[PDB]
Coordinates of C-alpha atoms in Angstrom, one line a residue:
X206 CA 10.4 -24.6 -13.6
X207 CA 8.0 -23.0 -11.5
X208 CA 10.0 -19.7 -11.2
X209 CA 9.1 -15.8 -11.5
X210 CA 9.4 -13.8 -14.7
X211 CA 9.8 -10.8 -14.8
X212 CA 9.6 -8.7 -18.1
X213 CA 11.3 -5.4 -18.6
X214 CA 14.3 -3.5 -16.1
X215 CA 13.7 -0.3 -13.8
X216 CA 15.1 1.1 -10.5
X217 CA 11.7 -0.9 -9.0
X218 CA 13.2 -3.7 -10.6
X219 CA 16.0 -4.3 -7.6
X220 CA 13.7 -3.6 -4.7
X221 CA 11.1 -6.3 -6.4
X222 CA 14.0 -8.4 -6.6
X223 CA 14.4 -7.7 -2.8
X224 CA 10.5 -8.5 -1.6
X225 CA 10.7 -12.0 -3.6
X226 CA 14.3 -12.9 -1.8
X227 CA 12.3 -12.2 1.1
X228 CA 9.2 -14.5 0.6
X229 CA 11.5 -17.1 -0.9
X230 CA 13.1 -17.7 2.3
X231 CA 10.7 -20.2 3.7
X232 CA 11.2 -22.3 0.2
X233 CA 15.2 -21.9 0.6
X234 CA 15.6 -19.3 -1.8
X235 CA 14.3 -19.7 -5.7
X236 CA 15.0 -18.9 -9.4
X237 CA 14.0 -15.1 -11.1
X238 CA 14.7 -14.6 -14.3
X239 CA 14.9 -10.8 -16.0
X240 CA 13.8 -10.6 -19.3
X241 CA 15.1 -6.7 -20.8
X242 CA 16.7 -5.2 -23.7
X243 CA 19.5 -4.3 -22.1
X244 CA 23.0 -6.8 -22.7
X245 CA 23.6 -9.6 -20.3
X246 CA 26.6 -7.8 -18.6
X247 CA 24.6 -4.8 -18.0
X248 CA 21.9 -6.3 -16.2
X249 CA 24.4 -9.0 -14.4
X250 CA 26.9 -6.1 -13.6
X251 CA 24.0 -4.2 -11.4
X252 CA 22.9 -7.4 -10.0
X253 CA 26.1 -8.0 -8.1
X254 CA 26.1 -4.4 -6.9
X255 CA 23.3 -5.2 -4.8
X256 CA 24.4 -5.6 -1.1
X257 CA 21.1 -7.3 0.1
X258 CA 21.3 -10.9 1.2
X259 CA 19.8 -13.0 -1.9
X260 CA 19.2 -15.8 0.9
X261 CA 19.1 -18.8 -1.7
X262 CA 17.4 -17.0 -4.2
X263 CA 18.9 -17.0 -7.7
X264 CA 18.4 -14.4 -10.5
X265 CA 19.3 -15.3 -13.9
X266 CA 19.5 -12.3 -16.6
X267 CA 19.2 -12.6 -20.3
X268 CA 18.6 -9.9 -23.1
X269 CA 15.6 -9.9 -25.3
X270 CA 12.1 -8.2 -25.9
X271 CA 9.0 -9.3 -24.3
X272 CA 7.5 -8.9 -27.3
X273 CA 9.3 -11.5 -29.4
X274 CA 7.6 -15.0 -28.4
X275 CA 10.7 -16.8 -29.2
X276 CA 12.4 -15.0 -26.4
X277 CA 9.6 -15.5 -24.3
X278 CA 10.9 -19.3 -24.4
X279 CA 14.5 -19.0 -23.5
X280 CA 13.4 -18.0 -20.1
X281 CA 9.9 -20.2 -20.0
X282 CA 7.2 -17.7 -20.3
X283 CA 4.8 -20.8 -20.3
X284 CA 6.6 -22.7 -17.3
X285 CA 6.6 -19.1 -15.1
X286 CA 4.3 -18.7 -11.6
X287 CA 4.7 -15.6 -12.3
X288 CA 4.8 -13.3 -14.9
X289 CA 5.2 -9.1 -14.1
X290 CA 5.5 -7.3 -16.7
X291 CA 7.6 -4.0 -15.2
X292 CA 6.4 -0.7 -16.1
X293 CA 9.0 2.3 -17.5
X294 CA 10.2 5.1 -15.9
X295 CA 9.7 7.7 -18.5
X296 CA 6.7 8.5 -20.9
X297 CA 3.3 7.4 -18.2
X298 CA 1.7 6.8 -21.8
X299 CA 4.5 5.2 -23.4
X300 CA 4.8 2.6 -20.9
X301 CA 1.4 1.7 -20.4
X302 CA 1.5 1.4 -24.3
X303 CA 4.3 -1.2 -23.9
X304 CA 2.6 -3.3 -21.0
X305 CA -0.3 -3.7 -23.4
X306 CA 1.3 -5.0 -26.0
X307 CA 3.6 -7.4 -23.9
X308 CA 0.2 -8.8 -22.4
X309 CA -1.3 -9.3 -25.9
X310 CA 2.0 -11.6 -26.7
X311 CA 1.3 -13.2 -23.4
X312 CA -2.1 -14.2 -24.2
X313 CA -1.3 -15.5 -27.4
X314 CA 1.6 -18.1 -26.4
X315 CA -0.6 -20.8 -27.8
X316 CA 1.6 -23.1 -25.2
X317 CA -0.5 -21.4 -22.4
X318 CA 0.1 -20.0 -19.1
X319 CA 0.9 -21.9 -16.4
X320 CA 0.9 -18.5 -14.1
X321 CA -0.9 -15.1 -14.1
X322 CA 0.6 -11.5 -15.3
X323 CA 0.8 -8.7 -13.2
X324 CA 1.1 -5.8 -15.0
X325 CA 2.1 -2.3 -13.0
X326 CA 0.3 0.6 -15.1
X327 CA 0.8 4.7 -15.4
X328 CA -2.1 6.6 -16.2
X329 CA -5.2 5.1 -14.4
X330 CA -7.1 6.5 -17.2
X331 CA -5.1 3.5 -19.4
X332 CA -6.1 0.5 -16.9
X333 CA -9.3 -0.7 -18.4
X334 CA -8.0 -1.5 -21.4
X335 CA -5.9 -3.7 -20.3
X336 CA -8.2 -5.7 -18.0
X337 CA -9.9 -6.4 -21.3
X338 CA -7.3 -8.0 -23.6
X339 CA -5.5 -10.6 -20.9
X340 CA -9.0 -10.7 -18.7
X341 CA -8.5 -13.4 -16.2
X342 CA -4.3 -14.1 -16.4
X343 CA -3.9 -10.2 -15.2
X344 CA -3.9 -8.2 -12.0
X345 CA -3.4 -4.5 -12.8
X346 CA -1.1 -2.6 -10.3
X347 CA -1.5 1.5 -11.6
X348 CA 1.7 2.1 -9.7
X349 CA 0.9 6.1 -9.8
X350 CA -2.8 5.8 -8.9
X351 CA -1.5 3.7 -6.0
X352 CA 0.9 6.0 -4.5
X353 CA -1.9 8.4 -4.8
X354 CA -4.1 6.4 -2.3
X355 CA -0.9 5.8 0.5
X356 CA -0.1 9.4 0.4
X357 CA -3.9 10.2 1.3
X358 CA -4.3 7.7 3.8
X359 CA -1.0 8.0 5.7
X360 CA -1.9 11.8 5.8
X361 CA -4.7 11.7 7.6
X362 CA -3.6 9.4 10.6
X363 CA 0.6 8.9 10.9
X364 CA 2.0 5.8 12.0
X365 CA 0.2 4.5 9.6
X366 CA 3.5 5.3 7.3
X367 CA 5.5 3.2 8.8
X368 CA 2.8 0.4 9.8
X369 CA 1.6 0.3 5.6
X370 CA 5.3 -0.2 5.2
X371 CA 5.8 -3.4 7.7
X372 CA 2.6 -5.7 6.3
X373 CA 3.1 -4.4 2.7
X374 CA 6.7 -5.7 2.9
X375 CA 7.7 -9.5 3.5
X376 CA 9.9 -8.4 6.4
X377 CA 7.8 -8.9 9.4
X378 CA 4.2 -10.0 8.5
X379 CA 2.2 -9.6 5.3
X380 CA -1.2 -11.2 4.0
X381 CA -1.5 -14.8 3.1
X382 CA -4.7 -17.3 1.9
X383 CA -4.4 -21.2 2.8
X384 CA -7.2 -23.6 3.3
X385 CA -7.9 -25.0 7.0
X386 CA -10.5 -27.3 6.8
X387 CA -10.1 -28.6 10.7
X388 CA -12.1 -25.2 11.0
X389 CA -15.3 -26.4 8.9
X390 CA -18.4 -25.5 10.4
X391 CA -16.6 -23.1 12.6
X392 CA -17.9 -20.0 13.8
X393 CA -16.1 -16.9 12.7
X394 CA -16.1 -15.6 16.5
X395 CA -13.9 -18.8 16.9
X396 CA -11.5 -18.6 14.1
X397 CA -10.8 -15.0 14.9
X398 CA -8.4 -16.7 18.0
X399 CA -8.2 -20.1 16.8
X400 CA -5.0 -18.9 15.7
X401 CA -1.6 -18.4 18.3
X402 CA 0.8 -17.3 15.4
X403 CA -1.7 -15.3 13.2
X404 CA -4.7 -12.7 13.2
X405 CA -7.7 -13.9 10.8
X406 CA -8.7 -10.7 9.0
X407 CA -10.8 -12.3 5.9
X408 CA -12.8 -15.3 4.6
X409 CA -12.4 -16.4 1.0
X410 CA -16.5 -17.5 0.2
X411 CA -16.7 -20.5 -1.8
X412 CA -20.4 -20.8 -1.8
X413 CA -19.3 -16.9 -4.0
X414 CA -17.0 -17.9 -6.2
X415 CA -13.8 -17.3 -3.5
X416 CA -14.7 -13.8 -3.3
X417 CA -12.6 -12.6 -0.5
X418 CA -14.6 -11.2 2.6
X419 CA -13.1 -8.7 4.8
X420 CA -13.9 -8.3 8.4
X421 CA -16.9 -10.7 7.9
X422 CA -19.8 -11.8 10.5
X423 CA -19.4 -13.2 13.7
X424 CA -22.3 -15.6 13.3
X425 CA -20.8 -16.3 9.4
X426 CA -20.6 -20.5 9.2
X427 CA -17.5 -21.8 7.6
X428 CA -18.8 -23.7 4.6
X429 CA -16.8 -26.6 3.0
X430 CA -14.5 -24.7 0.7
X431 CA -13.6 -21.7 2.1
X432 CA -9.8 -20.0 2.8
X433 CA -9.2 -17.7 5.7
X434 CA -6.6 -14.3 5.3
X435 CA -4.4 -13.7 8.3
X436 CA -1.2 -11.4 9.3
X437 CA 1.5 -13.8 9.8
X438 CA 5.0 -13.7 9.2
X439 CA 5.3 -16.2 6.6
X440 CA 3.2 -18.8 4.5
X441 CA 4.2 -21.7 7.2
X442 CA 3.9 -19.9 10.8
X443 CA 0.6 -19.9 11.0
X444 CA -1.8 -22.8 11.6
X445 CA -5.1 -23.2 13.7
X446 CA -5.7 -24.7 17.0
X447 CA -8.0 -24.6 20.1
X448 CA -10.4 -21.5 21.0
X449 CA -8.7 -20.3 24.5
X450 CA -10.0 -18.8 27.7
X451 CA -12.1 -16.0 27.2
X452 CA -10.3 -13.1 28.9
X453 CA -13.6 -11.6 29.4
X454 CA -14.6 -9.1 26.7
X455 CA -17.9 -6.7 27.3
X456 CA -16.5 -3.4 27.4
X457 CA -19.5 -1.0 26.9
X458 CA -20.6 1.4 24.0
X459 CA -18.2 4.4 23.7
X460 CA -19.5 6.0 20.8
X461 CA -17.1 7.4 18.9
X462 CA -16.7 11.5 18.4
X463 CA -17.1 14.1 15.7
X464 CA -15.5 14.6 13.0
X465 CA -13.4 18.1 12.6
X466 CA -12.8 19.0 8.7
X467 CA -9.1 19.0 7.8
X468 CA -7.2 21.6 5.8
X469 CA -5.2 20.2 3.1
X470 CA -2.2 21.4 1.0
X471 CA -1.9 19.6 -2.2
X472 CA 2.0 21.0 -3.5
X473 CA 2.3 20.8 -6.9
X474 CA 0.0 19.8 -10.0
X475 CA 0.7 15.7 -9.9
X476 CA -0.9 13.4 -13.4
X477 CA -4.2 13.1 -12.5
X478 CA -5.0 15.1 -9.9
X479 CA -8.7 14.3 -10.3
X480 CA -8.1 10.9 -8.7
X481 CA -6.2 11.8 -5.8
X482 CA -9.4 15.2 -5.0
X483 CA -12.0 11.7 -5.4
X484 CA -10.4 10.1 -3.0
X485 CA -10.0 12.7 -0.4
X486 CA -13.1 14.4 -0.5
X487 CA -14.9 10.7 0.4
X488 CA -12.5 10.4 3.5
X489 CA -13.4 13.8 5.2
X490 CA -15.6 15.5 7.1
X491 CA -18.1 18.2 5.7
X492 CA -16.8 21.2 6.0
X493 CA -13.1 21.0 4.8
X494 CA -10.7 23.1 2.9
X495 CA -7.9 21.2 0.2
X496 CA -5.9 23.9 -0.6
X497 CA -3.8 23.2 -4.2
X498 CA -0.3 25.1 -4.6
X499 CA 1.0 24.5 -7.8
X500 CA 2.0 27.0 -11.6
X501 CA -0.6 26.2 -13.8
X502 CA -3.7 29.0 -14.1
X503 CA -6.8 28.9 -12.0
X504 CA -8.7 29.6 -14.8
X505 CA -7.2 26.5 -16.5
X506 CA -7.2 24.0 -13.8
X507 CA -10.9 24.0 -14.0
X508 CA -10.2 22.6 -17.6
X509 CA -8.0 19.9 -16.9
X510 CA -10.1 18.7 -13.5
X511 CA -13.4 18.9 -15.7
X512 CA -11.2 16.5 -18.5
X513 CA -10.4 14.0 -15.9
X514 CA -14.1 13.3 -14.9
X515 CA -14.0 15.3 -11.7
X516 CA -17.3 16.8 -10.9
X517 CA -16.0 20.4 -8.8
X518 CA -19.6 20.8 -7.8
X519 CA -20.0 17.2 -7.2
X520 CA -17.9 17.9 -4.7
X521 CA -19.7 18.5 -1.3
X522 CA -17.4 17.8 1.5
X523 CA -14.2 20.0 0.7
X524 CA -14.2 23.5 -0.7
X525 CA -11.5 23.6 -3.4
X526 CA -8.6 27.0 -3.0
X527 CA -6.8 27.7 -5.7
X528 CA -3.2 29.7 -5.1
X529 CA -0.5 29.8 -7.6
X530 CA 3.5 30.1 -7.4
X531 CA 6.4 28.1 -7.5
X532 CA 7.1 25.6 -4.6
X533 CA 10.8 25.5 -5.1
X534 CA 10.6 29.0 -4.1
X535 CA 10.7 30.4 -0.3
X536 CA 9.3 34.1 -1.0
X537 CA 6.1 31.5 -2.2
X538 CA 6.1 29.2 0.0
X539 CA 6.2 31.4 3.2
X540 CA 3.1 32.9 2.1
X541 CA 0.7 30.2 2.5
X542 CA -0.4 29.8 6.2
X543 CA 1.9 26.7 6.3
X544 CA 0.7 26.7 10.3
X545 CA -3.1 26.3 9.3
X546 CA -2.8 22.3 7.2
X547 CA -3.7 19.9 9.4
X548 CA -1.2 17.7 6.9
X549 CA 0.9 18.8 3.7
X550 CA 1.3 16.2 0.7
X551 CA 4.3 17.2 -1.5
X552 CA 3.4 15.7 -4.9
X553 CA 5.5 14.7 -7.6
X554 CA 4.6 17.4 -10.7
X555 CA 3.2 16.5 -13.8
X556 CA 5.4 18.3 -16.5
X557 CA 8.8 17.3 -14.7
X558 CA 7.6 13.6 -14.1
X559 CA 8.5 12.6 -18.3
X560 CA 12.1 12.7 -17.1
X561 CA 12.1 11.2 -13.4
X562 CA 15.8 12.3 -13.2
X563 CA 14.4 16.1 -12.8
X564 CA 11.0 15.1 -11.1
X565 CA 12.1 13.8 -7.8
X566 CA 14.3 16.5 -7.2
X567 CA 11.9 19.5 -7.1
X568 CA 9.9 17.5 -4.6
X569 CA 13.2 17.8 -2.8
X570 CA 13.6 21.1 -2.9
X571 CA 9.8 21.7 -1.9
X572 CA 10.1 19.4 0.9
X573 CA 13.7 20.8 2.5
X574 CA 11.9 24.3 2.3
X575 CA 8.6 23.3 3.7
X576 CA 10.7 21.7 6.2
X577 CA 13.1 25.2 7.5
X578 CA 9.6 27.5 7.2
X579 CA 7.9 25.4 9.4
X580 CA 11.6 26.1 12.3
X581 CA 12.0 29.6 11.1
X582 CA 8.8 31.5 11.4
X583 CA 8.2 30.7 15.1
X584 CA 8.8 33.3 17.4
X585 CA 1.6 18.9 10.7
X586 CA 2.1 16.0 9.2
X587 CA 4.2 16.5 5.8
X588 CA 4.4 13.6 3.6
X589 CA 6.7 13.3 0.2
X590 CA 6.3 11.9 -3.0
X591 CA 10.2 10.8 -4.1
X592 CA 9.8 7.8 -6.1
X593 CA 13.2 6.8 -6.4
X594 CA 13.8 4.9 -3.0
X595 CA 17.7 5.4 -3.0
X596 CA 16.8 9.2 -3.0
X597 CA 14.4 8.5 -0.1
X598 CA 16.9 6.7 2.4
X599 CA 19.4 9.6 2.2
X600 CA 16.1 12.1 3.3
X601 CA 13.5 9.8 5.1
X602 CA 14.4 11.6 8.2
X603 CA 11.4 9.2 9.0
X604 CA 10.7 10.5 12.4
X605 CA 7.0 10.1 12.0
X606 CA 4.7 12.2 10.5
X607 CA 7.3 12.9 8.2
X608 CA 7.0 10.2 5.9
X609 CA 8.4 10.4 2.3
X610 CA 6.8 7.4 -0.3
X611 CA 9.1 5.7 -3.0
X612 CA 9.0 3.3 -5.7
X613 CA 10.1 0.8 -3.2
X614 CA 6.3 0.1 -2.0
X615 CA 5.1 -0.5 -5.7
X616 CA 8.0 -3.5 -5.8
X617 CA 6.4 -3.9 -2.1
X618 CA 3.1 -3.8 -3.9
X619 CA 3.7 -5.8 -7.2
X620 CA 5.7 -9.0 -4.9
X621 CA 2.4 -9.3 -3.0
X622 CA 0.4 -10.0 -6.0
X623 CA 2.9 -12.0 -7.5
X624 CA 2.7 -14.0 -5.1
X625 CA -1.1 -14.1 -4.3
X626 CA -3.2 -12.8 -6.8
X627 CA -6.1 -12.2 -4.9
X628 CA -4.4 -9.8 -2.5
X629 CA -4.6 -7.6 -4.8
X630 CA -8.2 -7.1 -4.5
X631 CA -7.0 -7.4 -0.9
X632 CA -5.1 -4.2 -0.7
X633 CA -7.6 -2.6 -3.5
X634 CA -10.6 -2.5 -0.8
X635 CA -7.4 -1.3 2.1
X636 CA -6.7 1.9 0.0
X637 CA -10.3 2.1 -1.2
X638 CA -12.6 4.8 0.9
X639 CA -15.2 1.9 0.6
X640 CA -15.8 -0.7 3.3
X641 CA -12.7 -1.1 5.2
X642 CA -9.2 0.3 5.9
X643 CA -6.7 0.5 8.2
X644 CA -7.1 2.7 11.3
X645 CA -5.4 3.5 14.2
X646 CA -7.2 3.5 17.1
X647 CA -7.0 4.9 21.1
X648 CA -7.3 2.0 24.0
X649 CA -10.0 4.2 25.2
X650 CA -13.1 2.5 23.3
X651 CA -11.1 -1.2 24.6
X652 CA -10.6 -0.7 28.2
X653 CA -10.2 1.0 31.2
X654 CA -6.8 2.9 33.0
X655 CA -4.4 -0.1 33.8
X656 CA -6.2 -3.1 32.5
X657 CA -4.9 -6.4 32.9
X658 CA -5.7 -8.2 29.6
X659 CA -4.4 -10.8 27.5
X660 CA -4.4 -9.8 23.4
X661 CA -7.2 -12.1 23.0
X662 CA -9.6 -9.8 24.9
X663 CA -9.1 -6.9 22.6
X664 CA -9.2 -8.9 19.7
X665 CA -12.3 -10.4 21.1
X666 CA -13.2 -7.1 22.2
X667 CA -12.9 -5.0 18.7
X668 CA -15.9 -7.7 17.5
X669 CA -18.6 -5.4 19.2
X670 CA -17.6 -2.7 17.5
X671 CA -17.1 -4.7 14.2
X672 CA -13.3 -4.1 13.9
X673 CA -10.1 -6.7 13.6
X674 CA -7.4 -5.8 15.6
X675 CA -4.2 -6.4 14.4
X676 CA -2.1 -4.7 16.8
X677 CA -1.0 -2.1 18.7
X678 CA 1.7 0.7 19.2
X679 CA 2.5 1.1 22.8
X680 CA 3.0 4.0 24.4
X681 CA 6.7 4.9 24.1
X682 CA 7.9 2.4 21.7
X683 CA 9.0 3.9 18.4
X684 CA 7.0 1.2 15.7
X685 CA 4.3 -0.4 16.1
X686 CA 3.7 -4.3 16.9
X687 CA 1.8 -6.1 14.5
X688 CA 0.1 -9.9 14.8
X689 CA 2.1 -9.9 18.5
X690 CA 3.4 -13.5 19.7
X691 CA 2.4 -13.6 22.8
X692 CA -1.3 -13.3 23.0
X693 CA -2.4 -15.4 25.8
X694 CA -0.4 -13.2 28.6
X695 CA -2.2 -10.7 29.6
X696 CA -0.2 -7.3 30.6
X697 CA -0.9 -3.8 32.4
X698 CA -2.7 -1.4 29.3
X699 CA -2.8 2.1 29.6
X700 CA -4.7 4.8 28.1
X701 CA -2.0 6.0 26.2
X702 CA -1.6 2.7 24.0
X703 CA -3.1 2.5 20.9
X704 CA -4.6 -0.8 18.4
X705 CA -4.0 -1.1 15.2
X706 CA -7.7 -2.2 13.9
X707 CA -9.5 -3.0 10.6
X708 CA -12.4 -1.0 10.5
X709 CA -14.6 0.9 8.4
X710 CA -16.1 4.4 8.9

């Protein structure tokens, strides 16, 4: 039947249900079918209370375990595209013991899989295993390790928040793979603007084995066999053409400048801290400062970071302080030099998370607080872990630079790879400190004061710097623009605008 399966019920469950609506649109809707131990009613009931437009897309529910084969065939585990098997929101080890065990019954329908499984994991430190049983059929999504990396990221340059939120949704554009052989022999120089309706970010090498190439060489031949990766706004507005006019592109060097270390509050003691101090200390400068305010003992955080393969004096760039309190608390919070963090991550704690009902809402408090210190002391960009999206809306007080993450962008996250697998190791490099990432970047290094160019000279322009440009923010408009339409006009820039690029260090 060609349809998506998905295996288990959440509170992701109804934003994935969104993202695949959304994609589905340029098909004229499809079929879903929910596979949980919950009764038919139940599920169906909180179906219809869902006031987001479908848009020709069905969902059928049906009660049953996704361990039973012979439940697995009532909704055509076999005849599936797609398989996700949906993580829990309780016990991190619980559920990551469940998705193992629903991926060995996958593996072992001796009818075969038609699709792949993408299964969305807990603890990062339970992903390997899992990548071991299924092999090939799965893409891991480690759901908390994730929204570890987006945090980091988005708090070291804003705008990013709400730019990581456009392309990693299917509203506006997103990331798609197709095959255009008119481009064969092509030059990569050329393909970067063959295109009027997209932005040609990677190259999927066949001569490799289809490994996908971000942000490759200029001089880079298109063999017979290859797939480019663009930004468009759907798997049918995008299509090659003819290389245009070259709105002439040799701005000079501008080197770029140093790099000031950042001061860091990490608010309460999330699973796996470890991960999230691995991550951060590779993005800055020598010479910073991650502060952690959280309850548990100095003495015993050493413990539990040595336990989760963190090496403390490994560590080189950042300088770890250690303060304890509680951050639900003002007398606490007031104490730290909440003027001196160049950005403040609010974290979701580790003993509160095996309830989520609980977990979110001390976040809440921390962040309301953080918030009123911030206004009250006087005579930094703050960003919030609240994984329940429906808690977000209500406090998003987006602004920018005031960005609170939910669940939402894992549904975000687990529709992209259920609907091309090999985005995933897409977005894996994207929130991976090696080779590229998303930046945002001033028009200084692009052009001079009031330079009339068309979007085809930056994005020919970025190429001597060995950056993709994928769009821009101008200078007063609230979000920015990505994979424009109208790229052969050339308009009035300023030094105020800014280009969102795809660079790396």
């Amino acid at each position: 039947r060609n349809h998506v399966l998905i295996l288990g019920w959440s509170d992701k469950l109804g934003s994935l249900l969104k993202q695949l609506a959304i994609a589905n649109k340029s098909v004229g809707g499809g079929v879903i079918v929910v596979l949980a131990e919950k009764e038919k009613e139940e599920m169906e009931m909180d179906i219809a209370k869902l006031e987001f437009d479908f848009m020709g897309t069905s969902v059928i529910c049906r009660s049953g375990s996704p361990l039973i084969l012979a439940d697995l065939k009532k909704v055509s585990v076999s005849k599936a595209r797609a398989i996700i098997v949906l993580a829990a929101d309780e016990n991190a080890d619980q559920s990551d013991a469940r998705a193992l065990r629903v991926v060995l019954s996958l593996a072992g329908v001796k009818e075969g899989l038609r699709g792949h499984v993408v299964v969305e994991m807990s603890d990062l430190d339970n992903e390997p295993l899992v990548k071991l049983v299924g092999g090939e059929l799965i893409e891991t999504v480690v759901a908390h390790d994730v929204i570890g990396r987006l945090m980091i990221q988005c708090a070291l340059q804003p705008g990013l928040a709400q730019i990581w939120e456009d392309i990693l949704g299917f509203e506006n554009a997103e990331f798609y793979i197709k095959r255009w052989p008119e481009l064969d022999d092509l030059l990569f120089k050329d393909i970067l603007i063959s295109f009027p309706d997209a932005i040609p970010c990677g190259v999927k090498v066949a001569a490799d084995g289809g490994k996908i190439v971000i942000n490759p060489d200029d001089n880079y031949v298109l063999r017979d066999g290859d797939e480019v990766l663009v930004i468009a706004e759907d798997d049918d507005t995008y299509a090659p053409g003819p290389l245009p006019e070259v709105r002439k592109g040799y701005f000079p060097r501008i080197r770029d400048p140093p790099k000031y270390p950042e001061k860091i509050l990490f608010c309460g003691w999330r699973r796996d801290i470890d991960d999230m101090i691995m991550v951060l200390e590779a993005f800055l400068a020598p010479g910073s400062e991650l502060w952690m305010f959280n309850e548990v003992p100095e003495k015993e955080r050493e413990r539990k970071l040595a336990a989760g393969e963190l090496d403390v004096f490994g560590l080189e760039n950042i300088k770890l302080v250690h303060r304890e309190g509680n951050a639900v608390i003002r007398r606490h919070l007031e104490s730290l030099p909440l003027e001196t963090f160049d950005s403040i991550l609010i974290l979701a704690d580790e003993s509160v998370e095996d309830s989520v009902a609980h977990s979110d809402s001390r976040s809440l408090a921390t962040l309301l607080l953080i918030r009123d210190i911030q206004s009250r002391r006087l005579p930094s960009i703050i960003i919030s872990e609240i994984l329940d999206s429906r808690t977000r809306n209500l406090v998003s007080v987006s602004r920018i630079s005031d960005y609170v993450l939910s669940n939402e962008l894992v549904s975000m996250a687990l529709a992209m790879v259920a609907e091309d697998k090999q985005i995933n190791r897409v977005l894996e490099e994207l929130f991976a400190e090696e080779g590229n990432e998303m930046c945002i970047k001033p028009a200084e290094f692009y052009l001079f004061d009031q330079e009339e160019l068309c979007f085809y000279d930056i994005m020919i322009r970025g190429r001597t710097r060995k950056e993709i440009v994928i769009g821009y923010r101008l200078a007063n408009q609230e979000r920015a623009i990505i994979n424009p339409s109208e790229k052969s006009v050339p308009r009035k820039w300023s030094l105020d605008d800014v280009f969102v690029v795809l660079a790396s260090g």
